[PDB]
Design a protein around this ligand. Structure first.
Ligand SMILES: NC(=O)c1ccc[n+]([C@@H]2O[C@H](COP(=O)([O-])OP(=O)(O)OC[C@H]3O[C@@H](n4cnc5c(N)ncnc54)[C@H](OP(=O)(O)O)[C@@H]3O)[C@@H](O)[C@H]2O)c1
Length: 298
């Protein structure tokens, strides 16, 4: 089944592919359909699932929780990731989109995540975005309260620069387990700006979001050349689709990213993880890179 990967030295073990529930409300599944969807991706070996407090106007967590109430035995088969730190205008009290990373909000957000998800613990809690008002001492207090109470097993960040990563890690007695960042052929600046250098150096694995550009891979005109090349490499690799080749292109990176699947169709989920079997050459990798960017490596 899907490869298991240690997220950090003595960190949690995740599935190499993650099921992301950003778009859960868009799928318009009944709780029973969601149970079946979860059961099927667990059976494929997709055990790690990705959430945030804000997703679906603060509804995805609770909808996922309706499934876990229906089939509580499923909790022991999965690793739950959720996030906090963002405040959207979906809440009436928020007249602007902003960030909240104070201690009490982090503790209370995770506690609310537990109630929404119908579970007694999170495997991993992320700070969702770097915040110019983040006091690392206060986040550290919140993490220890959550870890010491057994409510959260591991902690991480998302979309952090290396300086922001290092700032927070300096306050923590345990290793941050991921920096969940955007990695795709259509979005590559983290390959060179130091983010993926730091993660490889520390042996911390990134969860990778919008690996398909949130759909932009299929629909934006300026990626016609990328689609053509992915099709040619798919033919060479006997892959089933261009997205399988994209997933192989992400999996090839030496930080060993974990692609997060965003599709609500279990057949796309099933097809995505076939990417593990592909044997992409370096030249195929650099051919795909050039097709996306338009220019050669220096
Ligand atoms: N930490 C962060 O800041 C952050 C930000 C964004 C996302 N994320 C996480 O990353 C996960 C994945 O992000 P994402 O949802 O944008 O993933 P993605 O794979 O890049 O985009 C998924 C979108 O593309 C569609 N899709 C898949 N295959 C397609 C195909 N052959 N043709 C046309 N459309 C296709 C999907 O719709 P269908 O369901 O119809 O297949 C879905 O709408 C999210 O669930 C979330 O957990 C994190």
């Amino acid at each position: 089944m899907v490869q298991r990967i240690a997220m950090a030295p003595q960190g949690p073990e995740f599935s190499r592919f993650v099921m992301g529930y950003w778009r859960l409300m868009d799928w318009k599944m009944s709780p029973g359909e969601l149970v079946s969807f979860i059961e099927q991706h667990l059976d494929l070996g997709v055990t790690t699932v990705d959430h945030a407090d804000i997703y679906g106007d603060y509804q995805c967590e609770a909808a996922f929780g309706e499934a876990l109430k229906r089939a509580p035995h499923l909790r022991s088969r999965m690793e739950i990731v959720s996030k906090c730190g963002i405040a959207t205008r979906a809440r009436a009290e928020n007249t602007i989109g902003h960030y909240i990373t104070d201690r009490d909000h982090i503790v209370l957000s995770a506690e609310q995540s537990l109630r929404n998800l119908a579970t007694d613990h999170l495997d991993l809690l992320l700070i969702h975005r770097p915040d110019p008002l983040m006091d690392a001492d206060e986040v550290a207090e919140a993490f220890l309260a959550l870890h010491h109470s057994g409510k959260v097993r591991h902690f991480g960040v998302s979309n952090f620069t290396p300086a922001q990563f290092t700032l927070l890690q300096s306050r923590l007695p345990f290793t941050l387990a991921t920096n969940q960042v955007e990695i795709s052929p259509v979005h590559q600046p983290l390959l060179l700006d130091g983010t993926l250098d730091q993660l490889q150096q520390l042996r911390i694995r990134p969860m990778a979001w919008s690996c398909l550009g949130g759909g932009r891979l299929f629909n934006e005109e300026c990626f016609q050349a990328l689609r053509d090349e992915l099709a040619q490499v798919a033919h060479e690799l006997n892959a089933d689709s261009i997205e399988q080749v994209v997933y192989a292109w992400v999996l090839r990176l030496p930080s060993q990213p974990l692609p997060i699947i965003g599709s609500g169709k279990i057949e796309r989920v099933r097809s995505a993880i076939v990417a593990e079997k592909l044997s992409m050459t370096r030249q195929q990798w650099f051919r795909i890179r050039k097709a996306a960017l338009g220019y050669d490596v220096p």
